[PDB]
Amino acid sequence: KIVNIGAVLSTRKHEQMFREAVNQANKRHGSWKIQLNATSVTHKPNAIQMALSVCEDLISSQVYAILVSHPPTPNDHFTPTPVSYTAGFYRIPVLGLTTRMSIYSDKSIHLSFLRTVPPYSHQSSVWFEMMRVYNWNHIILLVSDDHEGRAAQKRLETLLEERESKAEKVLQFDPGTKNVTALLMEARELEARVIILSASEDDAATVYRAAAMLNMTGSGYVWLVGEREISGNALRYAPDGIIGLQLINGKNESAHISDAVGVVAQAVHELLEKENITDPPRGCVGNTNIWKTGPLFKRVLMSSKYADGVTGRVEFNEDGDRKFANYSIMNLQNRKLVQVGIYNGTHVIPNDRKIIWPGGETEKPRGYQMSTRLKIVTIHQEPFVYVKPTMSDGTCKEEFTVNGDPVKKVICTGPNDTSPGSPRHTVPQCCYGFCIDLLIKLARTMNFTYEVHLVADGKFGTQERVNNSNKKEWNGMMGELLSGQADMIVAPLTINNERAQYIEFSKPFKYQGLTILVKKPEERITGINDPRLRNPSDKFIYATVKQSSVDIYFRRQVELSTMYRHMEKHNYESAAEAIQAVRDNKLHAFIWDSAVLEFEASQKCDLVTTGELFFRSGFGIGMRKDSPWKQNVSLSILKSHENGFMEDLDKTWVRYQE
Amino acid sequence: VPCRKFVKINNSTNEGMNVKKCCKGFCIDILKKLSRTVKFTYDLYLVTNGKHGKKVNNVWNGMIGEVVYQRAVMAVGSLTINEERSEVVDFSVPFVETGISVMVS
C-alpha cells in the first residue's frame, strides 16, 4: 500500500518542495490508504559510481518514478542515460526533466524513458510555422550534431511532405572544425537566405565569426537560431537583429518539479483503479526476471490526460513529449534581448514591438535572389548548336544570312573531343543556331544575364548503377544539372516519365515524331512494321545513339527486346558519327527524330526518311525544381508560341532548304 | 459512362431537368484509364453555360467559370491553352499535338 518515488536532486530547498508536493499529493484524493514516500540522492563528481549508487539504491528502494532535475551539470554531455538504462532493464519509466536530446526520442533504445519536454526539432516545426506566415519555400539547413542530425532531417522532410517541397542544401559534418567558410560561400551563391542552425555553442560561435569575417549580415539575409546558439561566446559573437527562441518556464525548476509530481501522482491514482498490479522485486541479488506490467504501465502513461497545472495542459503522444507549449520569440536589438513574439500550441502572435532586421526595413526580407546569371549548359546538336572556332582571340565572325539578318552568336565554352581522345582541352568558341537565338529572345524578354557553356560528353544522360555501393546514378546533362554546376538545360531534351519524377518541366517548344534515315527493290523500310527488322540479321544495320533516351524508351517496351539486343552492338557516341557512317554506306537504318533528319535531307538529297510517323512527342527546356524562373519563363515560351516568332525561327533554319 | 445535362424547358422559367445520357470517345477513355491507374472516385457531369471560356467584365463562362470559381475540380475535356488561361489556372503537361488549320476544297 506504499509507492516510492526516487529522485536525483542536490539542493535542499527543491528537496523540501519535492517532499511537500509528495505530502500534498494525497490531500484531495480522499482518505484512501495509499502512502507516498520519496527518496532523493545527491551527486559524486564521477558518473559510473553515481550510476551504481543510484541504480542499486533505487532497486533497494523499489521506486516507480525516477527523476533527474540538474540543469547546471559541469559535463556538457547532459547524459542521465545509465539510470534510465538500468530502469529499462526492468522496464521502469524514468521521467527526464532537463535535457532535450533527440537520442532519448528513440523508444527502441530508451524502452522506458518519458519526458515532459520536446526535442529541439519541434523548434524547427515552429520555424515551419515561420514558413506559414512569411510565405517562404526555400531553406538552408546546417547541422553539426550527428546524434540528432538524422532525426532533425527526418522531421524536416516529414514537415515538408505536406507542401511536397525540398530543402535547397543540407549539411552534416564533424563538430570542432573551423573551415566551414567555403560551404558558407556556396550558400551565398544559392537563391535562398534562410539560415537554420543546429549545433553546440562552439560551432555556433565559429559560424558566427565566419559569417562576420565574410560580412553576411547585409540586407536580405535570414537569421534564425535557438536558445543553445545564443549562449557563451556565441552570445558575444551574436550579430544584432537576430531572431531567437525562448522556452517559457524551461529553466524554472520548482514549478516544473511540482507539475511532474502532479503528473506522477495522478498517473499513480489512475493506475490504482486497475488489477494485475505487479511490483519490481529486489533485482540486485539473484533476480533477473523482468517486471511483467512494464508495457501495461507504459500504456497507462500513454493515456495520460490532464487539465490542471502551472503552465498548461500536459499529455504524452506517440513520441512521449510535451505538446501545446507556449514559446517566446526574442530579437537582439543592439546586443539586448527584446521580445517580439509569443507562440501558442500552433499559432504565432507578434506583439506591438517592431521586428528590427539586420539589413534594411522592418518588413520581411525577400531573401530569394533569383539567378540573374544563368549557367546555360547544352549538348552539341547538329542543326541547333553550331560551334565554330574563333578568328584570333574570343571573337565571332559576324556572317550575314540571306535575309539580311546578321548571325547573333555567343561566346560558349566547350571541349575539343571526347575523353579518350581529348581528355582536358576546353576553349571558348562561338556558338549559334536555334536555341541560342531562343535564349537571346528570352534575355530580351526577361531581366537576366546568362552564361553559355557545354556538356562534357555527347550523351543526354541515363540512369545506371555505379559500381560501388550498388546505387543508380545519372550522368550527362542530368548529371551536371543536379550537381549544381549548371542552371538550365537549354537543349532539345527528351521528355519522358523518369525525368519528370526528379525535376520539373516547362512547355515544349519542339513537336516531332520518330523516323528512319536511309540512303537512296524496296530500299525503304516503312517504319517499325518491317518484318525483316522484327527478326534482324547482319544485313539490315539499324542503330541508335549510345546512352540515349530512345534506348530507355525501347527498354520499357518489352515486346521488342530483340531490337534492344541488336542496337547494343552498334551504339554510336554522336549522331554525326552515324551520318558519317551512313554516308560511307556502313549503316543501313537509324532511329531518330523527324525534323533533324528532314533538315539533313535538305542538306544532302540522298538522305531519305521513312513513312511511319510514330511517337509524336515534344521537346522542351530542361529545368530545375520549384523556382521563380518557372512561371515567367513558361509565359514567355507561350508568348513565343502564340505569335509568328516560331515561324521566324523556321525562316532561320527549319523552313529554309538547300 | 453516364452523365447529366441540365436542359431547361423554355425561356419563360429557369427550371429545367437533369437528363441523364451516355458518353464515349477519346477523353472518356482517358478518364477511365486515369480511374484505372489512380483508383479514385469521379463526379462527371456537363456544363450548361456554354463554350470553353470568355471573360466579360471579370466574369468567365463555361468550363473556365466552373473551374476558376471552384464549382468543379479539374477540366479533363478538350481546352485550348493561351496566356490568361495559364494565368488563372495551372494546366498539366500537353499530351496530344493539336494545332490550328484551315479547311479548303
UniProtKB/Swiss-Prot annotation, chain A:
Query: What glycosylation sites does the entry record?
Result: 37, 179, 215, 252, 276, 326, 344, 416, 447, 467, 535, 632
Q: How does it sit in the membrane?
A: Multi-pass membrane protein
Provide the protein's localization.
Cell membrane; Postsynaptic cell membrane; Synaptic cell membrane; Postsynaptic density membrane
Q: What's known about how it's activated or inhibited?
A: NMDA glutamate receptor activity is potentiated by Zn2(+) in a dose-dependent fashion. The potentiating effect of Zn2(+) is at submicromolar concentrations and its inhibitory action is at high micromolar to millimolar concentrations. Excitatory glycine receptors are inhibited by D-serine at 100uM.
Its principal location? Answer: membrane
Give the function comment from the record. Answer: Component of N-methyl-D-aspartate (NMDA) receptors (NMDARs) that function as heterotetrameric, ligand-gated cation channels with high calcium permeability and voltage-dependent block by Mg(2+). NMDARs participate in synaptic plasticity for learning and memory formation by contributing to the long-term potentiation (LTP). Channel activation requires binding of the neurotransmitter L-glutamate to the GluN2 subunit, glycine or D-serine binding to the GluN1 subunit, plus membrane depolarization to eliminate channel inhibition by Mg(2+).
Put simply, this protein is called Glutamate receptor ionotropic, NMDA 1
- Provide the species name: Rattus norvegicus (Rat)
Q: Which gene encodes it?
A: Grin1
Boundaries of the shown chain within the full protein: 25 to 797 of 938
From Swiss-Prot, chain B:
Compartments it resides in: Cell projection, Dendritic spine; Cell membrane; Synapse; Postsynaptic cell membrane
Domain of life from the UniProt record: Eukaryota
Task: Name the glycosylated positions.
Answer: 10-11
Which positions bind L-glutamate?
78, 80, 85
Q: Disulphide bridges in this chain? A: 3-23
- What tissues contain this protein? Detected in brain cortex, olfactory bulb, hippocampus including the dentate gyrus, striatum, thalamus, superior colliculus, inferior colliculus, midbrain and cerebellum (at protein level). Detected in brain cortex, hypothalamus and cerebellum.
Domain comment? Contains an N-terminal domain, a ligand-binding domain and a transmembrane domain. Agonist binding to the extracellular ligand-binding domains triggers channel gating. A hydrophobic region that gives rise to the prediction of a transmembrane span does not cross the membrane, but is part of a discontinuously helical region that dips into the membrane and is probably part of the pore and of the selectivity filter.
Known function: Component of N-methyl-D-aspartate (NMDA) receptors (NMDARs) that function as heterotetrameric, ligand-gated cation channels with high calcium permeability and voltage-dependent block by Mg(2+). NMDARs participate in synaptic plasticity for learning and memory formation by contributing to the slow phase of excitatory postsynaptic current, long-term synaptic potentiation, and learning.
Q: Give the record's family classification.
A: Belongs to the glutamate-gated ion channel (TC 1.A.10.1) family. NR2A/GRIN2A subfamily.
Subunit info here reads: Heterotetramer. Forms heterotetrameric channels composed of two GluN1/zeta subunits (GRIN1), and two identical GluN2/epsilon subunits (GRIN2A, GRIN2B, GRIN2C or GRIN2D) or GluN3 subunits (GRIN3A or GRIN3B) (in vitro). Can also form heterotetrameric channels that contain at least two GluN1 subunits and at least two different GluN2 subunits (or a combination of one GluN2 and one GluN3 subunits) (in vitro). In vivo, the subunit composition may depend on the expression levels of the different subunits. Found in a complex with GRIN1, GRIN3A and PPP2CB. Found in a complex with GRIN1 and GRIN3B.
State the name under which the record lists this protein.
Glutamate receptor ionotropic, NMDA 2A
UniProt organism field: Rattus norvegicus (Rat)
